[PDB]
Protein backbone atom coordinates (compact mmCIF):
# COMPACT_ATOMS: atom_id res chain seq x y z
CA UNK A 1 0.00 0.00 0.00
CA UNK A 2 1.19 3.76 -0.71
CA UNK A 3 0.11 6.66 1.62
CA UNK A 4 -2.62 8.82 0.93
CA UNK A 5 -1.32 11.60 -0.52
CA UNK A 6 1.15 9.73 -2.98
CA UNK A 7 1.03 11.24 -6.61
CA UNK A 8 -0.58 9.53 -9.09
CA UNK A 9 -0.23 10.57 -12.72
CA UNK A 10 -3.31 10.92 -14.67
CA UNK A 11 -3.54 10.64 -18.79
CA UNK A 12 -4.27 13.97 -19.45
CA UNK A 13 -1.85 15.70 -17.64
CA UNK A 14 -3.63 15.53 -14.55
CA UNK A 15 -1.87 15.02 -11.35
CA UNK A 16 -3.89 13.40 -8.52
CA UNK A 17 -3.08 12.28 -4.77
CA UNK A 18 -4.11 8.23 -4.29
CA UNK A 19 -6.78 9.55 -1.43
CA UNK A 20 -8.72 11.10 -3.99
CA UNK A 21 -7.70 8.85 -6.87
CA UNK A 22 -11.00 7.45 -8.41
CA UNK A 23 -12.17 4.17 -10.25
CA UNK A 24 -12.07 5.20 -13.80
CA UNK A 25 -9.15 7.18 -14.19
CA UNK A 26 -6.19 6.32 -16.17
CA UNK A 27 -2.58 6.77 -14.49
CA UNK A 28 0.66 6.10 -15.70
CA UNK A 29 1.94 2.73 -14.66
CA UNK A 30 5.53 0.59 -16.18
CA UNK A 31 4.42 -2.99 -18.47
CA UNK A 32 6.58 -5.66 -17.53
CA UNK A 33 9.17 -4.80 -20.36
CA UNK A 34 9.87 -1.26 -18.61
CA UNK A 35 7.59 0.91 -20.98
CA UNK A 36 5.34 3.64 -19.44
CA UNK A 37 1.32 3.27 -20.58
CA UNK A 38 -1.57 4.59 -19.20
CA UNK A 39 -3.49 2.22 -17.33
CA UNK A 40 -7.21 2.66 -16.21
CA UNK A 41 -7.50 2.43 -12.16
CA UNK A 42 -10.67 -0.26 -11.95
CA UNK A 43 -10.66 -1.23 -7.98
CA UNK A 44 -9.06 -0.79 -4.73
CA UNK A 45 -7.69 -3.78 -3.13
CA UNK A 46 -7.29 -1.47 -0.26
CA UNK A 47 -8.61 1.58 0.83
CA UNK A 48 -8.40 3.17 4.31
CA UNK A 49 -7.68 6.44 5.22
CA UNK A 50 -7.72 6.42 8.73
CA UNK A 51 -5.60 3.03 8.97
CA UNK A 52 -1.89 3.82 10.87
CA UNK A 53 0.47 2.25 9.38
CA UNK A 54 4.19 1.84 9.46
CA UNK A 55 5.97 2.52 6.00
CA UNK A 56 9.53 2.49 4.14
CA UNK A 57 10.70 5.93 2.47
CA UNK A 58 12.60 5.15 -0.53
CA UNK A 59 14.00 8.63 -1.74
CA UNK A 60 16.46 8.87 -5.19
CA UNK A 61 19.44 10.44 -6.42
CA UNK A 62 16.97 12.39 -8.40
CA UNK A 63 14.35 13.62 -5.99
CA UNK A 64 11.60 11.24 -5.69
CA UNK A 65 10.29 9.95 -2.38
CA UNK A 66 7.78 6.68 -2.54
CA UNK A 67 6.37 5.49 0.73
CA UNK A 68 5.22 1.91 0.71
CA UNK A 69 4.48 -0.64 3.29
CA UNK A 70 7.18 -3.28 3.82
CA UNK A 71 5.89 -6.08 1.61
CA UNK A 72 4.64 -3.70 -1.46
CA UNK A 73 6.49 -4.95 -4.43
CA UNK A 74 8.62 -1.97 -6.19
CA UNK A 75 10.30 -2.31 -9.54
CA UNK A 76 14.11 -2.93 -8.84
CA UNK A 77 16.72 -2.56 -12.00
CA UNK A 78 19.79 -5.43 -12.28
CA UNK A 79 22.32 -3.99 -14.43
CA UNK A 80 24.65 -6.74 -13.98
CA UNK A 81 22.33 -8.92 -15.47
CA UNK A 82 20.51 -6.08 -17.10
CA UNK A 83 16.73 -7.57 -16.18
CA UNK A 84 13.92 -5.90 -14.28
CA UNK A 85 12.36 -7.18 -11.07
CA UNK A 86 10.24 -6.47 -8.31
CA UNK A 87 11.67 -6.32 -4.75
CA UNK A 88 9.76 -6.34 -1.51
CA UNK A 89 10.01 -2.38 0.07
CA UNK A 90 11.97 -3.53 2.91
CA UNK A 91 14.20 -5.49 1.22
CA UNK A 92 15.60 -2.35 -0.51
CA UNK A 93 18.72 -0.74 -0.26
CA UNK A 94 20.82 2.45 -0.60
CA UNK A 95 22.31 2.14 -4.32
CA UNK A 96 20.00 -0.53 -5.13
CA UNK A 97 17.96 1.18 -8.63
CA UNK A 98 14.68 1.79 -8.83
CA UNK A 99 12.61 2.88 -11.90
CA UNK A 100 11.66 6.85 -11.52
CA UNK A 101 10.08 8.77 -14.29
CA UNK A 102 12.49 11.08 -16.40
CA UNK A 103 10.50 14.75 -17.08
CA UNK A 104 12.49 15.07 -20.05
CA UNK A 105 11.50 12.16 -21.60
CA UNK A 106 8.96 10.84 -19.95
CA UNK A 107 10.39 7.25 -19.93
CA UNK A 108 11.36 5.53 -16.60
CA UNK A 109 14.93 5.15 -16.22
CA UNK A 110 17.15 3.48 -13.53
CA UNK A 111 17.47 5.39 -10.65
CA UNK A 112 20.23 4.84 -6.99
CA UNK A 113 18.16 4.78 -3.73
CA UNK A 114 20.19 7.41 -1.54
CA UNK A 115 18.22 7.07 1.53
CA UNK A 116 15.76 4.13 3.63
CA UNK A 117 13.96 5.53 5.72
CA UNK A 118 10.82 4.89 7.78
CA UNK A 119 7.57 6.62 9.24
CA UNK A 120 4.14 5.81 10.87
CA UNK A 121 1.34 7.76 8.98
CA UNK A 122 -2.14 7.43 8.79
CA UNK A 123 -4.30 6.15 5.41
CA UNK A 124 -3.59 3.29 3.02
CA UNK A 125 -4.26 2.78 -0.40
CA UNK A 126 -4.10 0.11 -2.88
CA UNK A 127 -4.84 1.10 -6.31
CA UNK A 128 -5.38 -1.90 -9.30
CA UNK A 129 -5.06 -1.00 -12.74
CA UNK A 130 -5.55 -2.94 -15.81
CA UNK A 131 -1.60 -3.24 -16.05
CA UNK A 132 -1.27 -4.26 -12.48
CA UNK A 133 1.60 -1.77 -11.86
CA UNK A 134 1.48 1.95 -10.60
CA UNK A 135 4.15 5.18 -11.20
CA UNK A 136 3.60 6.81 -7.78
CA UNK A 137 5.95 9.88 -6.79
CA UNK A 138 7.70 9.38 -10.34
CA UNK A 139 8.45 5.42 -9.30
CA UNK A 140 7.69 2.51 -10.89
CA UNK A 141 5.61 -0.10 -8.50
CA UNK A 142 3.40 -2.94 -8.69
CA UNK A 143 0.37 -2.29 -7.09
CA UNK A 144 0.08 -5.07 -5.02
CA UNK A 145 1.72 -5.50 -1.58
CA UNK A 146 1.88 -9.31 -1.36
Given at each position: CFTPESTALL???????LGELSIGDRV??????GQAV?????????????????????????????TVTPAHLVS???????????????????????????????ELRPQRVVKVGSVRSKGVVAPLTREGTIVVNSVAASCYAV
Open positions: ESGVRKPLSMTANYSEVILFMHRNLEQMQNFVQLHTDGGAVLVWQPESQKLTFVFADRIEEKNQVLVRDVETG
